[PDB]
From Swiss-Prot:
Keywords: Cell membrane, Lipoprotein, Membrane, Palmitate, Signal. Its main location: membrane. It comes from Escherichia coli (strain K12). The chain holds residues 23 to 72 of 72 of the full protein. GO terms for cellular component: plasma membrane. The keyword Cell membrane applies. It is a lipid-anchor. The keyword rRNA-binding does not apply. To E.coli YgdI. This is Uncharacterized lipoprotein YgdR. Coiled coil: none annotated. It is found in: Cell membrane.
Amino acid sequence: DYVMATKDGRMILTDGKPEIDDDTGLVSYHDQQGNAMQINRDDVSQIIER
């Protein structure tokens, strides 16, 4: 999906389609600006039924 609901409950509009580095727990997502940034796995709340 294209929305990342996070720990704080805030819905982040994403390009979607995130890549998680499962060796540490960093989630590489794409923001609206087309930015590939990494957030915390624990900060990832609701993406979709995984």
